[PDB]
RNA sequence: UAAGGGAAGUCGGCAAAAUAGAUCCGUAACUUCGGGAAAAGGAUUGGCUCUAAGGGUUGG
RNA sequence: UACCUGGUUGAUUCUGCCAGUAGUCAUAUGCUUGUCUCAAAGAUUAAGCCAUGCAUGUCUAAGUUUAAGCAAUUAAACCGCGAAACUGCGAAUGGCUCAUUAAAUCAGUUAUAGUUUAUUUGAUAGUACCUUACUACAUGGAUAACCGUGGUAAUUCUAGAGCUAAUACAUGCUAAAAACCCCGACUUCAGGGGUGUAUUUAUUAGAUUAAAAACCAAUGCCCUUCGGGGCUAACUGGUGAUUCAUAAUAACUUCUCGAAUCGCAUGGCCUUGCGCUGGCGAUGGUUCAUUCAAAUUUCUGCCCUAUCAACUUUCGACGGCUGGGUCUUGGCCAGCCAUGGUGACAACGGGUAACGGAGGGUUAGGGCUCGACCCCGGAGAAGGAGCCUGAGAAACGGCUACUACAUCCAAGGAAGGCAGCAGGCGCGCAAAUUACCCAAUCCCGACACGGGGAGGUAGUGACAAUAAAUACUGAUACAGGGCUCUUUUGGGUCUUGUAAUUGGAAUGAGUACAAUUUAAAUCCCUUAACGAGGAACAAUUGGAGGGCAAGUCUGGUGCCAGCAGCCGCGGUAAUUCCAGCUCCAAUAGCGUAUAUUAAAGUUGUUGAGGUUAAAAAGCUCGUAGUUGAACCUUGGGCUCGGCCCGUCGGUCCUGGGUCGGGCCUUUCCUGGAGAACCGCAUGCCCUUCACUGGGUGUGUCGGGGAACCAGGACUUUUACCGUGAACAAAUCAGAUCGCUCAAAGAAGGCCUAUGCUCGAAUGUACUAGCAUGGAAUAAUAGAAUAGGACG
RNA sequence: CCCGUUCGGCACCUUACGAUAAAUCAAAAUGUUUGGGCUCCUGGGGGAGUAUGGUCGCAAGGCUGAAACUUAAAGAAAUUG
RNA sequence: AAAGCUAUCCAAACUCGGUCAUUUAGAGGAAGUAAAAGUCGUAACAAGGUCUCCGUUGGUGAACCAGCGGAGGGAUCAUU
RNA sequence: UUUUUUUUUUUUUUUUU
């Protein structure tokens, strides 16, 4: 059977726009991200919320394709911590932005609990094996974590942090 | 008239051979549009027994 | 997410193209390439040629066993296993490819009342019918396997000779009794023959439209208070529609089927005879229905081309009739007759580097383009044709013949079809191992047991897609932005960088005990002891004038070499070549070439342009086509209801607007099964003008207007719009679930357990077809020689 | 011959509520606020109205009518020299 | 009941012509395009020094020239 | 209103309060 498949970026319209590049180069920098791909991932997603929501709101307000679209959007949005209770109800979907996306990433959340103390050792802990979700150890710092699943972060059992074992450097030195 | 070959004969297919009636089919370049044309090239053809069509005259 | 930029000029506004830009499940190629998941992969050209190996076989108690086979069995009488062979079934599935093919295939929608059907499923058969020497307590003859004798160089070649089985082949009796037609000696009224099903022919039934009196022609029959009455009966299926389903009669047949088959359990009865009976199954069998289907078949819909305008018809072209052939209809074919059929609304012919479609890519809408290829349909197996077996084939891992190619040879002969899976050659820009296994999905077989290059697993694999390493950090010294002060003692220690100055912790790429995975292995996952300080475990591909992010750097060359998609650079000061340094873009990827899409309002239906940029025929007439003046029931009122817009919030009733329904204003019957109006049997209120305690379903007088069934009559017909039914999956949009997220997948979750449960949604059917409503808009008819309407 | 009205013509003069890139236009207006009816023609410049096929003509020629290949402009109206 | 045989039918294949479609060789001839510091003239752009252009015909090394008819895209929007 | 032919290739400009 030909197996579904699908891509998660696009290129921009425009390869060496100016103001895009700067504007793209402050979320990297500030999110500790690896490369431009996965900046235009997010857009990408951003953009299929923000037209989904709008081609919604052309319908009409008893409509029932609307009433069940529009409120399964929104379930999605206020589980990942995206959204709030009072955003009702897709008019302050478009006011999202790429950066409201960014801080529910691993790597932000794991950085703004304070368990690390830069964004780029916040992405190297989550890749290495040493941060925890619940009882499930996360190592894709893309794991978007909802507001339900925020309270349950900690560092690995088995890491030398939290689980008390110490690593092939500090066994070394004995 | 001649086996096999088929112009190797000869200045040269000279001489001879080959084709040939009728019916049906098919017919090119070229053209002064009239022709070429029977172009080229094919098929049938006997005997016997039948069948059918194609007329006239006189009385409606 | 309805978008542009550079380039003609000294400069300008345009027409207009070129270039740039981005996507592609779209191919190739260059450089580079650590990890996880998933995974395309000899289509393009040569449907070209193929060495070799494999890809189709199959046994249950339940077809046939004397293996001189095993295993325990009895002298014997034959079974527990079980080979060979006969018998049955399958081999017509699957897999591969896209050569042919343009109303052809195909798609949606129809019909078979014009047909066949192995298998599955449910029913289903009583027949004195007539042949053998006869039998039903049971018929006959062959042939394998086997023993022995050979042939040829050679084949999955076979002969001669001796046996021997059937669920192989061929025969063959039947069940009583009822009833019906025919023949019938017998004074005016016994007996024998035939009658299952299958086949063919002929005939009959298979009904039903409103009622009554006369010579009957024919017996009229019975009831006869001997007038007169009833009566040759009662019942009788289905379809929109049949000569249908079905029944009956007269016959027919190279006379089908109606069991001479196998296993288990073995039990009952009395006339004790090796007497009569008893189930479950297996296989098989006629008809009917059903299933998988197949085959034709109705309507509508296919790219380019007029430098294709007429095509078909001698010898079938259109039709009618009779017959043949077919499973069946049909010019499918044979005979006879007639002259038709198609076409400017594009027939016929030609091209396709054309299999059709579901669908892929890209698009605001309208579109453009691709579709060999995981699914459905068609066709083919080197190229044509023919055919056997068989339910099913015009089969090719079947046969026969011809052409091409090709193999062995003792030269007499024999044998062949990879567009099946691997592999090779050739071809090309262009595409993988002569591996493991039926464990998973299913299929086939006599079948729980065997087989399956279907299929799965692994290897090659930068087709494409997902996640994601190449590093993290403290202090010290310095600088900047702040803070109270500017006595500038300024770092004093809030932050960020430079730290070329140092100390630390952590890990996977790799590696490997062990465990895990798997048919067996590999990998992932899990994890002992290993595995990091730059020299290591070292990221690349393009570019730096503009479009377009990034150099006023240095050296070399000197219109040379060279660069450059376009404009352009290079002639001894090159921001463009060759290099060094630095920087920019993407990053395990990047560049290049070709195809296509958007941009392109540069194909314009939406939506281009035609005075001068390309473009109004020299002018007029005119056919096809396209288009075409106005005009026919409007207005008003009576109302009734739904929804929406307000205050009333009943628990933790109100106006307006819209939409719809019936009536007035010149505006279907038969039987009504229930409806109903006119009064209702009761009932209801009322002027003081008849008292009351009853009765649901209703009968009749009667029924202007109505849904109900079912027969018929009267409806202008088309286009258009609304609604409804039906309308493969997969794809797409889209709902849910922490595969560690994601691409994916259809899972999962809860309880400690005992086992408990939600899911695996929903939308999408343009055009053509079916049913109904709407009656404006666009067409067409109607009464004029009235051959008009009305009882 | 004079004055005026009207229908139908050949044109002209001023203006822009409009149009066009502009010159200019009472049509080249009523068009991004884009649909009255019909026919024909064009898609960067060349090659080229050429080659070939067809057809008409006595001939000269007419009508129909490509492709390979090549090129970054060709061209229109105005502006200052 | 095998071989064989009679007559139709289906019909491969080959030969011989015909037609259509698509490729391909060819002496020679006549064009087009491109490349530049080649020879000869100077036809066009100004009244380009004979105003330019169109149709047709004839001629000439070449651009071109001339006759007939037309146009202004003219060098005249005009003479009372 | 006598006539007056020709001129070898390339080279001829950029940003803001
Ligand atoms: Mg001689
Ligand atoms: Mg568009
Ligand atoms: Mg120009
Ligand atoms: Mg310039
Ligand atoms: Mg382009
Ligand atoms: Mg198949
Ligand atoms: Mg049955
Ligand atoms: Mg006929
Ligand atoms: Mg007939
Ligand atoms: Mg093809
Ligand atoms: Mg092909
Ligand atoms: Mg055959
Ligand atoms: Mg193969
Ligand atoms: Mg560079
Ligand atoms: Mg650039
Ligand atoms: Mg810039
Ligand atoms: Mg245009
Ligand atoms: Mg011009
Ligand atoms: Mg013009
Ligand atoms: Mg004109
Ligand atoms: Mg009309
Ligand atoms: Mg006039
Ligand atoms: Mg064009
Ligand atoms: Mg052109
Ligand atoms: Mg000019
Ligand atoms: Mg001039
Ligand atoms: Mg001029
Ligand atoms: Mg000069
Ligand atoms: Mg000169
Ligand atoms: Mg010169």
Redesign the pocket.
Known sequence: ??????????????????AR??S??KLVGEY?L????????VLLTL??I??????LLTLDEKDP?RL??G???I??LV??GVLDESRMKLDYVLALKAEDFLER???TCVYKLGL??????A????????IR??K???????????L???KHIDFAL????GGG?????????A
């Open positions: 059977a030909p197996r579904s498949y699908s891509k998660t970026a696009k290129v921009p319209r425009r390869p060496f726009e100016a590049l700067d793209e180069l500790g690896r490369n431009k791909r996965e900046v235009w991932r953009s299929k923000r037209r989904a929501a709008r081609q394709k069940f679209e409120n399964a959007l379930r999605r589980r990942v990433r691993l790597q690390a103390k830069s964004i780029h050792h992405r190297v802990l989550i890749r290495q094996r040493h979700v619940g499930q150890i996360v190592n894709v710092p893309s794991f978007v974590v909802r339900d699943s925020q088995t890491s030398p942090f074992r110490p690593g092939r450097v500090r066994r070394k030195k």
